[PDB]
Design a protein around this ligand. Sequence first.
Ligand SMILES: Nc1ccn([C@@H]2O[C@H](COP(=O)(O)OP(=O)(O)O)[C@@H](O)[C@H]2O)c(=O)n1
Ligand SMILES: Nc1ccn([C@@H]2O[C@H](COP(=O)(O)OP(=O)(O)O)[C@@H](O)[C@H]2O)c(=O)n1
Ligand SMILES: Nc1ccn([C@@H]2O[C@H](COP(=O)(O)OP(=O)(O)O)[C@@H](O)[C@H]2O)c(=O)n1
Ligand SMILES: Nc1ccn([C@@H]2O[C@H](COP(=O)(O)OP(=O)(O)O)[C@@H](O)[C@H]2O)c(=O)n1
Ligand SMILES: Nc1ccn([C@@H]2O[C@H](COP(=O)(O)OP(=O)(O)O)[C@@H](O)[C@H]2O)c(=O)n1
Ligand SMILES: Nc1ccn([C@@H]2O[C@H](COP(=O)(O)OP(=O)(O)O)[C@@H](O)[C@H]2O)c(=O)n1
Ligand SMILES: [Mg+2]
Ligand SMILES: [Mg+2]
Ligand SMILES: [Mg+2]
Ligand SMILES: [Mg+2]
Ligand SMILES: [Mg+2]
Ligand SMILES: [Mg+2]
Lengths: 133, 133, 133, 133, 133, 133
Amino acid sequence: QRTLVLIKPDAFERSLVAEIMGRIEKKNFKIVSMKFWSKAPRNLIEQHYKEHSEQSYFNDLCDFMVSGPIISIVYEGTDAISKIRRLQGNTNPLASAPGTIRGDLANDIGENLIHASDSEDSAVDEISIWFPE
Amino acid sequence: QRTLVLIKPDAFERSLVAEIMGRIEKKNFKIVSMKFWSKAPRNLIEQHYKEHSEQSYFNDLCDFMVSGPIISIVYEGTDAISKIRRLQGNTNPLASAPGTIRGDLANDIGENLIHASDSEDSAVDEISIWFPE
Amino acid sequence: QRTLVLIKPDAFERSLVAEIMGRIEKKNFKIVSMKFWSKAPRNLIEQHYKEHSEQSYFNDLCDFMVSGPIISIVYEGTDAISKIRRLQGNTNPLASAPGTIRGDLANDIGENLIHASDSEDSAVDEISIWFPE
Amino acid sequence: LQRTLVLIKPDAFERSLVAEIMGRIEKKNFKIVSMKFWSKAPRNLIEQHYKEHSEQSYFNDLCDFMVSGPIISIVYEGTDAISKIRRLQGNTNPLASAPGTIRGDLANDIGENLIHASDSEDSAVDEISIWFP
Amino acid sequence: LQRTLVLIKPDAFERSLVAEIMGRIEKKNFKIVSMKFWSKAPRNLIEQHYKEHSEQSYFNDLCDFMVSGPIISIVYEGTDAISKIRRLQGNTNPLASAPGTIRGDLANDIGENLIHASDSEDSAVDEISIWFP
Amino acid sequence: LQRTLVLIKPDAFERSLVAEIMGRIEKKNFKIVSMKFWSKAPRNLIEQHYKEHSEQSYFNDLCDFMVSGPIISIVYEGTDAISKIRRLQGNTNPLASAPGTIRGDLANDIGENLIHASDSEDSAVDEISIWFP
Ligand SMILES: Nc1ccn([C@@H]2O[C@H](COP(=O)(O)OP(=O)(O)O)[C@@H](O)[C@H]2O)c(=O)n1
Ligand SMILES: Nc1ccn([C@@H]2O[C@H](COP(=O)(O)OP(=O)(O)O)[C@@H](O)[C@H]2O)c(=O)n1
Ligand SMILES: Nc1ccn([C@@H]2O[C@H](COP(=O)(O)OP(=O)(O)O)[C@@H](O)[C@H]2O)c(=O)n1
Ligand SMILES: Nc1ccn([C@@H]2O[C@H](COP(=O)(O)OP(=O)(O)O)[C@@H](O)[C@H]2O)c(=O)n1
Ligand SMILES: Nc1ccn([C@@H]2O[C@H](COP(=O)(O)OP(=O)(O)O)[C@@H](O)[C@H]2O)c(=O)n1
Ligand SMILES: Nc1ccn([C@@H]2O[C@H](COP(=O)(O)OP(=O)(O)O)[C@@H](O)[C@H]2O)c(=O)n1
Ligand SMILES: [Mg+2]
Ligand SMILES: [Mg+2]
Ligand SMILES: [Mg+2]
Ligand SMILES: [Mg+2]
Ligand SMILES: [Mg+2]
Ligand SMILES: [Mg+2]
């Protein structure tokens, strides 16, 4: 499987980019594609998060995602989608488990360091958004 | 919220002080106050652990807590009390989860490296004990 | 208690030997005996895994275990058997928890870095296999 | 303020040291301003990158190595980035690279040495225009 | 056996490197004998600390920086603590600090350089009496 | 390609630095070819190991220290293993061992200095035949 991961602007701000990538790297997942964005276009962000367009946090979320750089990465591995989701940790700081990326490093439900596709369907979708080629 | 954390004498003995503080630091909690005690007065210890005065381990616990230095720290952050408790890990070595401080580092129910307040009520209480000002 | 741990050939291949040993070392378990095997004899491997002789993976498993070096280690500590099992993590990569050795480092149900005895009975047994003296 | 061109070499991918190397540069507070992942760099880019070495005995082996796995090309930005990152990198020769340097700690071969860093202002501008034209 | 005075500078807090720096000194087996957290050090303590620099061009900027965030003052104890910790610290100038040193690995500015360490026996005694009178 | 003899000294066990030290050599890509755990090395092996020092003032204290806890004897293999691992090791004198070296980062005593490494081809062959006859 291939999954789409984003390193979010807060990781750059907090100098955690290598930390997060290294956790996935140490689990033996392989980078298939990678793009550095000094600032992602808002439209890309809005597409990526289209399922959230009616949520009260939608605009703050979009602002945050264009507030700094992003790295988009396609990772490949057996069951990569579910596995990276478990490494990522829960969105909520009251739930993300110590040992996960978010459990160890993130303290906010919004600024939470990392995106990972949550299903095969959304992976295909998100990979096409960030890597249309 | 603010929570009271103690680095216990075993952390000093095992050179784990930075390791433990760094875990909390990496989760983005801010130090509000901090005190180094070369040896905490026994009365302080007894006050801190007053709810345990009738337990069979009470005296050994007090002896341990004055057996070496302690750092008392007030940490501040959203939901800091519950969050630091989860990072800390369960008291019992048969239960504390890998990824938590105790799960990774502690092997004894007594010498377990770190105290953290378990509720808002006890936080206020413990902060007043270690930082009466 | 004493438990038998094997560092498997994949750990050597991936340069993870110190990483894994260090996790157990940091939990304060003591090495009682240790043997380095440039290649374990197949018969030893087959004895170690005798309960799996009827599984479809038995032969591939034996081939893997002689494909590179192994370190056998006897660790000692209170409840060392169950504790090291929890640090190890589940066999299945879909289940092993971030924070465990396998959850963090292993991505395959076969090549999973580390063996640890699962009970007192099997510990005694496995210790006698690797350390017959 | 300067920009320098870094390549993460194919041995870094093979040995799972990508984040380790990027992390050392990150902790030194250098900022990524461009980055491209190459599953396999074109021979000609490599030969152009090392055009100074084209008549050297090791040229063909060097170019072969450089196309034997993925690379990442990165432009780093910071005050005196060029000399400072050269210092982090360490000497080409494993007999001379100091512990604490990337190569001193991690590399054990004069050829397979994990990282390229531009060695001057002029070469930085040249290399940057090769990888990011 | 000697005592030396270390300050963790405000940039360390900003960049979440407090435990990282303390940890390097801890792993070298130096013992904390005094420690005080300052949410903001008094200007006058800072000016007294750096009184030697009072006529230097950078004095006002230095003092401003030093009161721009928290600091920790620490007295470390050990055999030849003064010269040894100075060695860990690394050169003031980022063009000269060796990789493997605190500043060589972590600092990228001559001013914002993370840590102060007493540079001699006499200055150690002076500085210790400033921060711990 | 060379082989060198390393001893992990009893202070490494006491301070839980076994994996830390082995890990530095591992990351440098040196391969273990022999390894033996000694819960307590025989006095005579130690005295033979250091026979060059037999008339030195520190000999008895050195031998006493060396039998005061476990040691691991390891034969490492790699290109120029002898000089390269000596470089990792760092100077005997804590006034001289460079940060980034094993001793520079970790050791704070001329006697208790964590690791032995053969210092030449001839001494490597001698020491290897002592520990692995
Ligand atoms: N209550 C919420 C939920 C999500 N969000 C943001 O929206 C993104 C997550 O929506 P999601 O439910 O798909 O969460 P993840 O898959 O990112 O865990 C998060 O990563 C947050 O940045 C938020 O700011 N507040
Ligand atoms: N069975 C027990 C329970 C607690 N204790 C000690 O008493 C303190 C804990 O009591 P507690 O139930 O408040 O535990 P924590 O909040 O520290 O996890 C522990 O940190 C131990 O040092 C003990 O020695 N034996
Ligand atoms: N479905 C399976 C189950 C086990 N195995 C192998 O057989 C060994 C495990 O059998 P086990 O159930 O005793 O697992 P652990 O105790 O090693 O977790 C594993 O470590 C794998 O190397 C496998 O290759 N495929
Ligand atoms: N004697 C040599 C010199 C360089 N080389 C290789 O080709 C590159 C030589 O470039 P260089 O001399 O500019 O060394 P660096 O600047 O990469 O340290 C090195 O990175 C090695 O990969 C080699 O294989 N043998
Ligand atoms: N040229 C300089 C020299 C020092 N400084 C600052 O003021 C302090 C100078 O003290 P120093 O020369 O005793 O340097 P260290 O002993 O801190 O390495 C440094 O830590 C810098 O923060 C500066 O900003 N510019
Ligand atoms: N002045 C000295 C020199 C060495 N020694 C000890 O004995 C060994 C001396 O051997 P050496 O001079 O060959 O030093 P290394 O090669 O171990 O760095 C050291 O590892 C110290 O443990 C000492 O205690 N005092
Ligand atoms: Mg989602
Ligand atoms: Mg409690
Ligand atoms: Mg089993
Ligand atoms: Mg060059
Ligand atoms: Mg100074
Ligand atoms: Mg010697």
